[PDB]
Amino acid sequence: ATVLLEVPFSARGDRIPDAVAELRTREPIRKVRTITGAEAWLVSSYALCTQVLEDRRFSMKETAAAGAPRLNALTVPPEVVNNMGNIADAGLRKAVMKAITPKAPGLEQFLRDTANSLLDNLITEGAPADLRNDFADPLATALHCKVLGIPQEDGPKLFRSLSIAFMSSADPIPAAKINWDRDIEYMAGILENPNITTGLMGELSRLRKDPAYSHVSDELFATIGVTFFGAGVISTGSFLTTALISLIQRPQLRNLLHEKPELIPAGVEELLRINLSFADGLPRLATADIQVGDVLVRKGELVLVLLEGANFDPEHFPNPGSIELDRPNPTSHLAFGRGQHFCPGSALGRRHAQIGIEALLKKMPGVDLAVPIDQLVWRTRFQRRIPERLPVLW
């Protein structure tokens, strides 16, 4: 005879392969081959995953080095692999972080109103409805337009870059460059547009004219807008879609949350823990020789941190495949990563999902799949696991 084990194992986002637990038990770090032909170390236990993510010698930025073993081809300029470091070095971290909290005045009510309106529209049109294309994704897209302070009507055209921008491809993608360059010009226009005074782009636009930021490049400011829109929308849309499947498949849970919506945040934390939204391990490149379990990882080697390996590890989360709302370590999952690169949009992602699920349970308490679960079409060669359509009735 056979060839080296290949990753990823399955694009299905509704079930974890039995193979993951067997791997975790027998070889929690082991060699695998990625879609580019490169070799990598696949890490699958909670203990080893957290070790890698907490040790900055396993570098995110160095993954972009010419000649490194790759998980997939870049769909961004190599400097953007260090996007958070670049934000931090420009003195913009605190401002970005403040602009993307779900606590801004009126933002939550906007999310509720938007979710309610999307659902009323589905209800009027009649079953079946597609909860990804006509609910989760538009909710994500509308949230991010509002966060960024850009017009709602520009959401759809930005969003349509993302089926390419988030590909997980063996080779470079011509369309990713075309879209990237166009979306950057869009966000450069936004920084020059006097009507844009709110949200992240309103704040960046002010900071750009402030003498404390006069040497920050226009490229960086536009990049922040493109990347935060893209990462946020893909991540929240994907998460919410596959969380809705997990909830639909658990009518006793669906009913407990409908009846006691105060438990929704605890439900969302468990939906997060069990989520299979990330299609690949998180990539890092070793910058030193580092012992990880039984393997001495060598400098210049690629390591992949399998989030579901950690999140279903029974030594950290007993009965890992069960959603239990009373765990003693409920936010200790790795759905938002860990360490230097911990998700800066985590609070926003939680609130998007909370409010989407709250609205859906209230408007469609009888929600159920309208097709057998095996009929869902899983997107392949992508950085997220998502069903192309999510047909439901109620």
Closest distance of CB 344 from ligand HEM, Å? 5
Q: Which two tokens stand for residue 178?
A: 């075309």
In what helix (H) or strand (E) does residue 203 lie, and over which residues does it extend? Answer: helix 199-207
Separation CA 111–CA 356 (nearest Å) = 8
Separation CA 357–CA 258 (nearest Å) = 9
State the CB neighbour count (10 A cutoff) for residue 276. Answer: 24
**3-class secondary-structure state, position 206:** helix
Binding segment (CB under 6 A) for ligand HEM, from list 30-38, 171-179, 311-319, 337-345? 337-345
Which residues pair with residue 303 across a beta bridge?
41, 284
149 touches ligand HEM by CB under 6 A: no
170 touches ligand HEM by CB under 6 A: no
Separation CA 121–CA 123 (nearest Å) = 5
Question: Nearer Cβ to ligand 1CQ, position 73 or 107?
Answer: 73
Widest CA span in the chain: 65
344 touches ligand HEM by CB under 6 A: yes
155 touches ligand HEM by CB under 6 A: no
Closest distance of CB 393 from ligand HEM, Å? 26
165 contacts which partner out of ligand 1CQ, ligand HEM, none, CB within 5 to 8 A by kind? ligand 1CQ
Q: Which two tokens stand for residue 166?
A: 């988030």
Question: Nearer Cβ to ligand 1CQ, position 44 or 161?
Answer: 161
302 touches ligand 1CQ by CB under 6 A: no
226 touches ligand HEM by CB under 6 A: no
Binding segment (CB under 6 A) for ligand HEM, from list 155-163, 214-222, 231-239, 250-258? 231-239
The alpha carbon of 349 is separated from its chain's Cα centroid by a whole number of angstroms, namely 9
**CB distance 34 to 72 below 8 Å:** yes
Scan residues 63-92 and list those touching ligand 1CQ (CB under 6 A): 63, 75-76, 80-81, 83
The radius of gyration of the chain from alpha carbons, rounded to an integer in Å, stands at 21
Question: Nearer Cβ to ligand HEM, position 32 or 282?
Answer: 282
348 touches ligand HEM by CB under 6 A: yes
Separation CA 278–CA 280 (nearest Å) = 6
Binding segment (CB under 6 A) for ligand HEM, from list 127-135, 213-221, 223-231, 244-252? 223-231
Separation CA 238–CA 375 (nearest Å) = 18
343 touches ligand HEM by CB under 6 A: yes
Question: Nearer Cβ to ligand 1CQ, position 71 or 122?
Answer: 71
End-to-end CA distance of the chain: 51
225 contacts which partner out of ligand 1CQ, ligand HEM, none, CB within 5 to 8 A by kind? none
Which amino acid is it at 83? N
Q: Which two tokens stand for residue 21?
A: 């637990």
Q: 183, 203, 280, 301: which one contacts ligand 1CQ (CB under 6 A)?
A: 183
The alpha carbon of 30 is separated from its chain's Cα centroid by a whole number of angstroms, namely 25
60 touches ligand 1CQ by CB under 6 A: yes
Question: Nearer Cβ to ligand 1CQ, position 183 or 358?
Answer: 183
347 touches ligand HEM by CB under 6 A: no
166 touches ligand 1CQ by CB under 6 A: yes
Residues 262-291, one symbol each (x = binds ligand HEM by CB under 6 A, - = not), give ---------------x----x---------
Closest distance of CB 144 from ligand HEM, Å? 7
Scan residues 71-100 and list those touching ligand HEM (CB under 6 A): 83-84, 100
Separation CA 230–CA 232 (nearest Å) = 5
- 328 by Cβ neighbours in 10 Å (0-12 / 13-18 / 19+) ranks as exposed
